[PDB]
Paper text:
Peptidyl-prolyl isomerases (PPIases) catalyze cis/trans isomerization of peptidyl-prolyl bonds, which is often rate-limiting for protein folding. [name] is a two-domain enzyme containing both a PPIase FK506-binding protein ([name]) domain and an insert-in-flap (IF) chaperone domain. In order to improve our understanding of the mechanism of [name] and of FKBPs in general, we set out to analyze the kinetics, energetics, and structural basis for substrate binding and inhibition of [name] from [name] ([name]) using 15-residue-long unmodified peptides, which we reasoned would be better mimics of natural unfolded protein substrates than the traditionally used 4-nitroanilide tetrapeptides. In total, we obtained five structures of TtSlyDFL and three of [name]ΔIF at a maximum resolution of up to 1.4 Å.
Finally, we also analyzed binding of the S2, S3, and mutated variants of the S2 peptide to a chimeric [name] construct, in which the IF domain is replaced by the flap loop from human [name] (henceforth abbreviated [name]ΔIF). Interestingly, peptides derived from S2 and S3 display a dual binding mode with both a high- and a low-affinity binding site. The highest affinities were obtained for the S2 peptide with KD1 = 0.161 μM and KD2 = 2.97 μM, followed by the S3 peptide with KD1 = 0.869 μM and KD2 = 22.94 μM. A comparison of the thermodynamic fingerprints of the S2 and S3 peptides revealed that the slightly lower affinity of the S3 peptide to the IF domain is caused by a reduction in binding enthalpy (which is partly compensated by entropy), while the weaker binding of the S3 peptide to the [name] domain is due to entropic effects. The TtSlyDFL:T1 and [name]ΔIF:S3 structures both show alternative binding modes. The S3 peptide binds to [name]ΔIF by inserting a valine instead of a proline residue into the binding pocket, which supports the conclusion that in vitro binding to the [name] domain does not strictly require the presence of proline residues. The peptide inserts a cis-proline residue into the hydrophobic binding pocket in all cases, except in the [name]ΔIF:S3 structure, where a trans-valine residue is inserted instead, thus further supporting the conclusion that proline residues are not essential for binding to the [name] domain. The non-canonical binding modes agree well with the weaker affinities of these peptides, but it is unclear if they mimic any physiologically relevant interactions. As discussed further below, this variability is intimately connected with interactions between the side chain of Y63 and the peptides bound to the [name] domain. The [name] flap loop inserted into [name]ΔIF in place of the IF domain adopts essentially the same conformation as in full-length [name] in the case of [name]ΔIF:FK506, while it is partially disordered in [name]ΔIF:S2-W23A and [name]ΔIF:S3.
Residue numbers in the entry:
A (entry chain B): 13 to 18
B (entry chain A): 1 to 68, 73 to 110
Write the structure that this text describes.
Amino acid sequence: GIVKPW
Amino acid sequence: MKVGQDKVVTIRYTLQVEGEVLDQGELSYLHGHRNLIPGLEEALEGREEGEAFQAHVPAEKAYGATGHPPHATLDFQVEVVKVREATPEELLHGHAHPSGHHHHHH
Ligand SMILES: [Ca+2]
Ligand SMILES: [Ca+2]
Ligand SMILES: [Ca+2]
Ligand SMILES: [Ca+2]
Ligand SMILES: [Cl-]
Ligand code: NI
């Protein structure tokens, strides 16, 4: 999840 | 509806770094709450639902020197699939929720 981090 | 603060935005995307597809897919996010890569959100600002565009995000508007590669330019191909206003619950949680109702907290 690099675009929308956790 | 245009992408802007407190909109829940659904995007289809392909992410390339140095010409290699790293990740692609579809996701929804709450705009204006630092929930995306900063440079990407800036590129999405004001886009109309249905718009397709490319965005170059320099490492400084993303992962900088650490990366997650160092000093990489992120190459996004983006489709704005859906734009809607957030629910009160999404605004108070500060994130987008799945369409199905399910009251909860964190
Ligand atoms: Ca390609
Ligand atoms: Ca946030
Ligand atoms: Ca276009
Ligand atoms: Ca619509
Ligand atoms: Cl979100
Ligand atoms: Ni929640």
